[PDB]
Design a protein around this ligand. Structure first.
Ligand SMILES: [Mg+2]
Ligand SMILES: [Mg+2]
Ligand SMILES: [Mg+2]
Ligand SMILES: [Mg+2]
Ligand SMILES: [Mg+2]
Ligand SMILES: [Mg+2]
Ligand SMILES: [Mg+2]
Ligand SMILES: [Mg+2]
Ligand SMILES: [Mg+2]
Ligand SMILES: [Mg+2]
Ligand SMILES: [Mg+2]
Ligand SMILES: [Mg+2]
Ligand SMILES: [Mg+2]
Ligand SMILES: [Mg+2]
Ligand SMILES: [Mg+2]
Ligand SMILES: [Mg+2]
Ligand SMILES: [Mg+2]
Ligand SMILES: [Mg+2]
Ligand SMILES: [Mg+2]
Ligand SMILES: [Mg+2]
Lengths: 205, 56, 81
RNA sequence: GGUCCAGACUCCUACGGGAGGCAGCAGUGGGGAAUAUUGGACAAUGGGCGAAAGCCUGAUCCAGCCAUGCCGCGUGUGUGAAGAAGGUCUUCGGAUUGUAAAGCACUUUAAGUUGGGAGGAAGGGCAGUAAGUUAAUACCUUGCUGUUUUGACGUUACCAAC
RNA sequence: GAACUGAAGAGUUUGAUCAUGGCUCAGAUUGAACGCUGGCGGCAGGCCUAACACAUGCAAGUCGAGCGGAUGAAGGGAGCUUGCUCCUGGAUUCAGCGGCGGACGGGUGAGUAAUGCCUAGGAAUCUGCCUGGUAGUGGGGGAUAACGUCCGGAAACGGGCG
């Protein structure tokens, strides 16, 4: 399945930016993002430790747009792997094909990059892939099919990704829309607000 | 009345004259074909029972 | 007698074969005496199409083991290379 | 899925007299909360016989049914404040459903239609040639060469177009 | 170079407290069943109960290059005349004798508490077809199925003689 619906109540409930719109205009001047959704919005309601852990996990899942069973699989694989599962989970989440296409500026958001990947418009090693879970390895060359290189979507996505910050782990060849995955981005390459310790704490119970 | 049957090549259509349960071969239905042709190995929908004909 | 034949594994429409030395009156995928390699009808990429132990195959052929038709053809092909 | 004897139980009968054993694959009644098709082919791997074509094979390879499980993918994407109409609550000020909808503009995965299209195939028949066996350019065995011939699944996986 | 790395508590006895102690809950699993709902595919699974009773199909045959016999093509012809007869030859097919197979493959878990299973040992045996050596295949005899014949039986079929 997939979460299809209002993609801004999630930001208000989580209480952070949690990028889900294109970021073109703003976030504050679309939803008054200071109240939880629903009738009881003005209430604050300090919550418990289990609530904090649940909110952290939900925030990560809604950032990357994956459901619970696939996320449990990701956690099990991160625990199986060596070296501190806490950032192993982020390493593994940051290597999905839709996320990589988003980071390369081909799509405005994760939903639009999923739209592109699922609709057979992306080739990884010169051959078509349409699974928005394909773990891209270091050194792959994500490109755009020639019959799909004239879509405007890519044009606006690129010109708007031009100003959001330098990822500095993928090299995009802007003129013909070809990328490159140098390596997985380390923990210091991501925002230092996610407390993955809460996620590991939640699942270890 | 001229007793026109339409085509015999239509899908079979008939009515149940009687029905019984046999201990060796299950429910057996005596049906009168009204039009069309009924062939062995055919999906049949009768009342609320459905199924396909092992034998005829 | 004692024969050398192909035991089928893998999955639906994706067959893999083990070259097995068996008493002839056993199940195709039942008990065996020894496995002396494998055969891959699809292979491709880094997978090898077939591999056999020359030493074990010659030893068992010297002890009076009758290979099947496919085992004979594949073994002579492996000996060719 | 052989013989003999005895037994319980079903059945035939022309009333003299015989037959049967699905805990093989389908299938039925019954019990139960509850568990599926009287399917196709020996094309592949095996087994029996044969000298060899070849015959047999409910093993096997496959199809049918059932969200029973595991895994993966869809049910769209961006913009959009008159913060529309309706609903709900209200301190009657308004808040919320909510960028949610409508509007505008994009995309066609899966499903639908059309057209291409592998891999599962080893072998067999015939014809020729060369070696070994003898006593022999015979028969036969073995290398190779040419020609012909094989797929249930199957409207295959996959690919392209609307 | 790896073959691991790993351990949470909460509610409830009292006016309140500490302890003891039971009950209950948060997790992971099913050959699952039921209720509501239901788009697709890949890979698996599917009588756990009555080892209850079974209608109907199929699931074990093959060898004519072991042996008689009867079925007897195409042809070469011969005669008469459009087609028949006859002969020589004879290709195909098998009811019977005989050789192998049927002790495999497939199903089920009733019995069994030890003649079973698991682990480690050993001594007094056999083993079709298969592999490698050694020595041979010389010469007679009496039968019998099939078949012809004679009766009985509704049939299944049975009996005597050559
Ligand atoms: Mg799922
Ligand atoms: Mg039986
Ligand atoms: Mg059965
Ligand atoms: Mg029984
Ligand atoms: Mg019942
Ligand atoms: Mg059921
Ligand atoms: Mg076969
Ligand atoms: Mg024959
Ligand atoms: Mg048969
Ligand atoms: Mg059949
Ligand atoms: Mg399904
Ligand atoms: Mg259900
Ligand atoms: Mg209103
Ligand atoms: Mg082919
Ligand atoms: Mg109290
Ligand atoms: Mg049972
Ligand atoms: Mg015969
Ligand atoms: Mg068995
Ligand atoms: Mg038992
Ligand atoms: Mg006892």
């Amino acid at each position: 399945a997939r979460y299809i619906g209002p993609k801004c109540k999630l930001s208000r409930r989580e209480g952070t930016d949690l990028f889900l719109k294109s970021g073109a205009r703003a976030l504050d001047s679309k939803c008054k993002a200071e109240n939880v959704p629903g009738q009881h919005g003005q209430r604050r309601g300090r919550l418990s430790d289990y609530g904090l852990q649940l909110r952290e996990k939900q925030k990560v899942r809604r950032i990357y747009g994956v459901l619970e069973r696939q996320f449990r699989g990701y956690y099990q694989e991160a625990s199986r792997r060596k070296g501190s599962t806490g950032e192993n989970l982020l390493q593994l989440l940051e290597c999905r094909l839709d996320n990589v296409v988003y980071r390369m500026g081909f799509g405005s958001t994760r939903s639009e990059s999923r739209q592109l990947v699922s609709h057979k418009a992306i080739t990884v090693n010169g051959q078509t892939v349409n699974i928005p879970s394909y773990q891209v390895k270091a050194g792959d060359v994500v490109a755009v099919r020639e019959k799909s290189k004239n879509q405007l979507r890519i044009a606006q996505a690129l010109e708007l990704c031009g100003q959001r910050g330098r990822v500095e782990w993928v090299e995009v060849d802007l003129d013909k829309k070809a990328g490159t995955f140098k390596s997985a981005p380390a923990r210091s390459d991501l925002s230092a607000d996610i407390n993955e310790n809460l996620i590991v704490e939640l699942y270890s119970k | 009345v001229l007793e026109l049957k339409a085509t015999p090549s239509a899908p079979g259509r008939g009515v149940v004259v009687e029905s019984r349960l046999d201990k060796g071969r299950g429910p057996v239905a005596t049906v009168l074909v009204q039009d069309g042709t009924l062939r062995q190995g055919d999906m049949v929908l009768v009342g609320i029972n459905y199924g396909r004909v092992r034998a005829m | 007698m004692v024969t050398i034949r192909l035991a089928r594994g893998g999955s639906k429409k994706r067959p893999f074969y083990h070259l097995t030395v068996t008493n002839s009156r056993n199940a195709r995928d039942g008990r065996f005496v020894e496995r002396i390699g494998f055969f891959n009808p699809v292979a491709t990429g880094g997978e090898v199409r077939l591999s056999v132990d020359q030493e074990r195959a010659t030893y068992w052929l010297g002890q009076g083991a009758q290979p099947s038709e496919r085992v004979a053809q594949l073994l002579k092909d492996a000996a060719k290379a």
